Write a protein that binds this ligand. Structure first.
Ligand SMILES: *[C@@H]1O[C@H](CO)[C@@H](O[C@@H]2O[C@H](CO)[C@@H](O)[C@H](O)[C@H]2NC(C)=O)[C@H](O)[C@H]1NC(C)=O
Length: 49
């Protein structure tokens, strides 16, 4: 199954830009054992939240 990472838009208002909105990915450290592969853009051209 691997691991899922999701990015989001920052806080926005009509005519205004506000603080960013992210998860706690920066403080997580993963072991690099033999490398990894990344699947990118699998859910393209679809309605998403
Ligand atoms: C990053 O955030 C995730 C999601 O909240 C944290 O995972 C939770 O950690 C708490 C505290 O130990 C546990 O009680 C929950 O069961 C965890 N949830 C899941 C889904 O794993 C995670 O610890 C955070 N990483 C940090 C702070 O380094």
């Amino acid at each position: 199954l691997g691991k899922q990472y999701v990015f989001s838009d920052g806080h926005s208002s009509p005519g205004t830009l506000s603080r960013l909105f992210v998860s706690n990915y920066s403080r997580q450290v993963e072991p690099f054992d033999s490398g990894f592969v990344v699947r990118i853009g699998a859910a393209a051209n679809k309605t998403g939240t």
